[PDB]
Amino acid sequence: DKGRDEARDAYIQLGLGYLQRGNTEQAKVPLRKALEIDPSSADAHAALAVVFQTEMEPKLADEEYRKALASDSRNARVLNNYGGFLYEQKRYEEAYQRLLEASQDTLYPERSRVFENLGLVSLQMKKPAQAKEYFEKSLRLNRNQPSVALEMADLLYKEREYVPARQYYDLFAQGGGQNARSLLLGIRLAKVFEDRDTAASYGLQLKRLYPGSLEYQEFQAEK
Template sequence: MSGCVTSTDSRFQREADREEAIENYVRLATAYIGQGNVDRARVHLDRATELAPDAASVLAAKGLLYQVDSEDELAERAYRSAISNDEGYTRARVYYGAFLYGKGRFEEARDQFAAASRDTEYQDRASVFFNLGLSEERLEDTDAAVRAYRRSVELSRGDVKSLLALSRTLVANGDFAAAEGYYARLMGIMQRNSNLRHSPESLITGIRIARYFGDSDREASLALLLKSDFPSSLEYQQYKVLNADGQ
């Protein structure tokens, strides 16, 4: 019996070692893709493929590599295969959703991000909801975008990108009271972190909120920043239209 147990344990250990090796190869390949080092990424991905050619993680990483190489058809095929082989592998849906969004296929991207958002164990769920919000905005469903951005804010405990997106969409929906609350949180974070700077988007959002509440001093201060720092921006042109229309 001890011999059988030893044999079984050994078999499980070999399988565990194999799974760990695959995971490490995929992690390294993905990191190198992020750094733009495609050659090194390909080396590690080839090793992962030798061990598990049909693993969802391997196929998803292949999709990323194909995407970097502008092999869009192969990339999409790899993403689809990854999801088909393991519908629970959320990272493949996230990669595929980003791919679809980049191609302007917003409804399909929304569906992938929506499916990914239901995985409560996924580590970067806040980003999934943020991307879902972006997709909903492009589909002109601002109510759904607000719901997604609000969830992103909750999960991220106040990520500045999510706070700004939520403030902006609340303004677009005419909910200035809620927008003011989230925008105030954003300003508080910016004041405490000297590395954060206003963007044209954050400035025009603040201007719209300040104008709605009749806060002319705050509006003037933000407008001055927008004019001095981003005179060629679309947002500055929007501000000039606001003034011309008296809105």
């Protein structure tokens, strides 16, 4: 430490600040300074990686993520962000392992999010049964996550388990957020439980956006 930690952490925040803005170029200055104080600064490298990840420089980003991991091997936040990065580069098998390593930290406040990601990566790898188990782990840690509930509902609707699916969809409805997809599910669900009211009520399809989406089309045909 030697007070250096404070100085380093400050340069990092300053760097993150510029990042949260979009001035990826200016952020580098403070981050590089933090790095001069602590060459093995996990956060410094991690921050620096998000920058390169932003400037569309996957190669440098990946390099910086590895550098961060080479210090705080038990840094769930970085592991999780790297997993998100790996997910974009479509390197699923690797994302899965990083996220799976991130979930080991039982104290990480966002551990429930880590399980969500693991579920999302399992879907892309064509492993529904595995994804469902992870989405469940996520709700097991915090039932109040509408996005995770939406994924549970969709997975259940496809197995034709309409009752538990509706239950999870309602858990997702209490969030107010809705997209073309979640709306088509709600309609299809309300249609199963003979709820012609709520079904039509989701007129948010035609208007309220998504007027020319596939979901809106399916709605028309199945209507």
